[PDB]
Design a protein around this motif. Structure first.
Motif, PDB file in Angstrom:
ATOM      1  N   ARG B 172       0.812  -1.192   0.000  1.00  0.00           N
ATOM      2  CA  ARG B 172       0.000   0.000   0.000  1.00  0.00           C
ATOM      3  C   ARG B 172       0.846   1.242   0.000  1.00  0.00           C
ATOM      4  N   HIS B 229      -3.508  -1.505  -8.650  1.00  0.00           N
ATOM      5  CA  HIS B 229      -4.778  -0.876  -8.975  1.00  0.00           C
ATOM      6  C   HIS B 229      -5.073   0.290  -8.041  1.00  0.00           C
ATOM      7  N   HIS B 252      -2.869  -0.265  -4.396  1.00  0.00           N
ATOM      8  CA  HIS B 252      -2.585  -1.580  -3.859  1.00  0.00           C
ATOM      9  C   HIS B 252      -1.858  -2.355  -4.949  1.00  0.00           C
TER      10      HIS B 252
HETATM   11 PT   LIG Z   1      -7.058  -4.165  -3.217  1.00  0.00          PT
END
Ligand SMILES: [Pt+2]
Ligand SMILES: [Pt+2]
Ligand SMILES: [Pt+2]
Ligand SMILES: [Pt+2]
Ligand SMILES: [Pt+2]
Ligand SMILES: [Pt+2]
Ligand SMILES: [Pt+2]
Lengths: 277, 272
Positions: B172, B229, B252
């Motif tokens: 992340r 994405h 992510h």
């Molecule tokens: Pt995700």
């Protein structure tokens, strides 16, 4: 112990670089280094087999003349080497050409009950890089925690200017307020491609934040004294916090204020190895 | 013009690289470029003289043969060279790296221009022999002459810079983490090559100032990237002006060992 203790380290005797593993592990790594009869001036341990908590252990041997060093080591340890064969036409390298420049690696080698990989390189090449950042490929590795298993005092002296220069690059890149986590991630960023280019690790490169957090106590030990010595850098946390803080603890990170005036930025820039005249 | 529009860019015609200044500035810069009779294959504008929020204007001239180019330029403009305090040595210097003439008056402007072998640039864009030249072009520039030739040599450089960012970042991360990471990769190279006469700036100020151009460059690459994405919905991306530094997108990415090995194997540093 405590972060406050780390602020009391003597830069002038390179105490911030004096990273040594526990007695038992140290004994094993030292036995590995001493197994080599070709003369090693500076021996470096680094990576997961040195900084723990089976794995291949990573070394760098800085030697006076690599050609001669490999001549000896080829006689003592011939099976450590594997050469490419002549399939086809040429690609024929001499002693000086294949051994004389860069880092030469023998990998998956069994030495004193350990599986090791060791890279051999010219001590002269390393010291020049530490002093001038010709490429920073070798210097960048020593801006991050390593263990000097031999030739410690000689190497630390040559490396202090490299470490303080990396801090100064960090200070140039960071805003007037930053955390130590921002600093170490910035510093790791500087050498990240260089470590890949030199093949220091056979495994996949790691995430910058995982690198920092796993070695947080060693980044603190290297750089907090340099931060403390730096004029215009202000530790924000109180004496109380710094005495209650375990250097191994990732749950909170120190915060700082730095002078970012034009004159300060000019002095950081012009003190870099890139800019010495 | 919105962030959503930036995702719909045609990577195949290098639309993410097509950064051009408003037509005002453009003619001035192109008259500066055209003032030179030594032929310039590719001309680059960058710096505060180009991305305006007068000052010296920074240029890079990529040329076919720098020694023959300086020969012609020493005839048309011998005052540009400050060498009269001392030629073999000057000529040796022309060959490699970037040679600069600075604080030079041209067509109304005080300019600084660096001359370098186009061949040297293109090889670095492809192989990262040093990444000293490629690093400059992982960040917003204006290509003033030779655009289509140059954009096509550079596209692999840009997506490689993204791939290094993905290697360095966790599963992340925000677009701010990413641009700052990318700027970190080339920060020392920009100092070593003396691209800028002024003091280096702070990484976060570089990014925030040029946030619309980092977005134009890298947002469509993130989009096309497998395993990555966007976290924000289609509606937020329609409500975002590319210049808005008050909100940063989130992402992510897959971080499995194979995904990481694929990113490593495709870097320009690999000899295969
Ligand atoms: Pt995700
Ligand atoms: Pt501790
Ligand atoms: Pt010798
Ligand atoms: Pt010998
Ligand atoms: Pt010999
Ligand atoms: Pt400690
Ligand atoms: Pt000169």
């Amino acid at each position: 112990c405590t972060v406050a203790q780390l602020l009391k380290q003597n830069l002038l005797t390179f105490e911030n670089q004096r990273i040594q593993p526990e007695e038992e592990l140290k004994e094993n790594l030292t036995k590995v280094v001493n197994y080599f009869q070709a003369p090693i001036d500076v021996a470096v341990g680094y990576g997961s087999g040195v900084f723990r908590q089976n794995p291949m252990i990573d070394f760098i041997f800085q030697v006076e003349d690599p050609v001669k060093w490999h001549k000896i080591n080829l006689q003592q340890n011939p099976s450590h080497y594997s050469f490419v064969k002549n399939f086809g036409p040429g690609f024929v390298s001499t002693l000086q050409e294949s051994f004389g420049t860069g880092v030469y690696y023998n990998t998956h080698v069994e030495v004193e009950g350990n599986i090791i990989k060791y890279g051999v390189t010219s001590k002269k090449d390393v010291y020049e890089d530490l002093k001038n950042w010709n490429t920073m490929y070798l210097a960048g590795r020593f801006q991050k925690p390593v263990v000097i298993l031999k030739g410690e005092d000689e190497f630390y002296k040559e490396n202090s200017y490299n470490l303080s220069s990396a801090l100064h690059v960090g200070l140039l890149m960071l805003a007037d307020r930053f955390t130590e986590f921002d600093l170490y991630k910035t510093i790791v960023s500087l050498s990240y491609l260089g470590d890949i280019r030199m093949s220091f690790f056979a495994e996949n490169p790691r995430k910058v934040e995982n690198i920092v957090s796993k070695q947080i106590a060693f980044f603190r030990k290297l750089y907090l004294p340099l931060l403390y010595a730096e004029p215009g850098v202000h530790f924000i946390e109180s004496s109380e916090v710094l005495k209650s803080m375990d250097p191994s603890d990732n749950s909170r990170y120190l915060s700082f204020h730095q002078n970012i005036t034009k004159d300060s930025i000019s002095r950081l820039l012009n003190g870099l190895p890139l800019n010495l005249v």
